[PDB]
Amino acid sequence: ISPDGSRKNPARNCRDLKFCHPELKSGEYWVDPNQGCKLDAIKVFCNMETGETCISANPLNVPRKHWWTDSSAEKKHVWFGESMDGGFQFSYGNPELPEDVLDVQLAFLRLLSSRASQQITYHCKNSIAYMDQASGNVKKALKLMGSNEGEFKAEGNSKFTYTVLEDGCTKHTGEWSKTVFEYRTRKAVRLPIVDIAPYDIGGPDQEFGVDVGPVCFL
């Protein structure tokens, strides 16, 4: 028999579980990309239609706040995790496992998957996330930091551009909205996303939140 994705019998990943157990529906399973001992398995969502292994961020969100003050009114990319007070870089997999173990489990998926993708949602109050309505351009768009020392941007090297799935942040309305970003690649080493650098921030009324989506490997 071939492991069925339970904690006692984790599969290698969700693709293997799909291949060997095509009866199983999308949901929560345990996978062990590094094989060997079963005890360091990680808990994931398996999309059984696509075969994707999806690992949630912990924590899932960055609360909505006035995170950055720069009263010189200068606008500049500022990394949330690297530079902001209360800042953290994004983390993935079972919080009860050692960080080193999670890093290796992710490394197996990042290095040896055919592709990967991840969405991230920026919650905005008076903060352009991508397009600025006044200008019609994306010069004020935020950046994302990948996992292979690379950045995902609105423009530039086309191998490194994200795409925007919706964009409700184009004007300062004094209200809350959101923009959803996605990076999709055949070089899964570049994922997951570990940081975000908003540009249109620093003013007294400028605020943001973040919902970090699961990194999904095929």
Taking the C-alpha atoms of residue 36 and residue 109, their distance in angstroms, rounded to an integer, is 15
Greatest CA span in the chain, whole angstroms?
65
Cβ 33 to a copy of itself shortest distance, Å: 9
Q: Is 34 known as a binding-site position?
A: yes
Residue 206 touches which of Ca ion, a copy of itself, none (Cβ within 5-8 Å per kind): none
Taking the C-alpha atoms of residue 44 and residue 7, their distance in angstroms, rounded to an integer, is 11
**Contact between 100 and Ca ion (CB under 5 A)?**
no
Cβ 130 to Ca ion shortest distance, Å: 40
Q: Is 137 known as a binding-site position?
A: no
- Please report, to the nearest 10 degrees, the dihedral formed by the alpha carbons of residues 110, 12, 28, 55 taken in order: -10
> Is the CB of residue 5 less than 8 Å from the CB of residue 20?
no
Q: Is 35 known as a binding-site position?
A: yes
Q: Pick from 13, 94, 119, 126: which binds a copy of itself (CB under 8 A)?
A: 13
**Contact between 11 and a copy of itself (CB under 8 A)?**
yes
Q: End-to-end CA distance of the chain: give it in Å, rounded.
A: 23
Q: Pick from 70, 82, 99, 175: which binds a copy of itself (CB under 8 A)?
A: 99
Taking the C-alpha atoms of residue 150 and residue 130, their distance in angstroms, rounded to an integer, is 19
Nearest to 88 by CA among 78, 97, 98, 80: 80
Residue 51 touches which of a copy of itself, Ca ion, none (Cβ within 5-8 Å per kind): a copy of itself
Mark the breaks in the chain: residue after which each occurs, C to N over 2.5 Å. none
Q: 138 by DSSP, 3-state: which? A: coil
Q: Is 167 known as a binding-site position?
A: no
**Contact between 103 and Ca ion (CB under 5 A)?**
no
Binding mask 26-65 for a copy of itself (x = CB under 8 A): --------xxxxxxx----------x--------------
**Contact between 34 and Ca ion (CB under 5 A)?**
yes
Nearest to 198 by CA among 147, 157, 159, 142: 142
Applying CB under 8 A, which residues contact a copy of itself? 2-3, 11-13, 15-17, 19-20, 34-40, 51, 99-101, 103-104, 107-108, 111-115, 218
Residue ranges at the known binding site for Ca(2+):
32, 34-35, 37, 40
Q: Which residues bind Ca ion (CB under 5 A)?
A: 32, 34, 36-37, 40
